[PDB]
């Protein structure tokens, strides 16, 4: 198939164990794309996977 790679725009700090976190920059993989305001998302080549708030990406 095919996935969206995304840059973070924002550092986003979590305390939730549900949560990833992330600094600006970094790729992330959208694993679901729920516009539910919360993605779920992982980390390249990592099994880090969490959600993300979905303001805080862009597209590459």
Same mark, same amino acid.
């Given at each position: 198939?095919?996935? &969206?790679? =995304? ?5 986003? @700090? ?6 990833? &976190?992330?600094? #600006?920059?970094?790729?992330? %993989? %959208? @694993?679901?794309?729920? $516009?539910?305001? /919360? /993605?779920?998302?992982? #980390?390249? !080549? &990592?099994? $880090? =996977?969490?959600?993300?708030?979905? !303001?805080? =990406? #862009?597209?590459?």
């Amino acid at each position: 198939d095919a996935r &969206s790679i =995304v840059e973070a725009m924002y550092d986003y @700090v979590s305390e939730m164990e549900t949560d990833l &976190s992330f600094t #600006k920059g970094e790729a992330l %993989i %959208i @694993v679901e794309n729920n $516009e539910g305001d /919360w /993605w779920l998302a992982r #980390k390249m !080549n &990592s099994t $880090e =996977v969490g959600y993300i708030p979905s !303001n805080y =990406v #862009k597209i590459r």
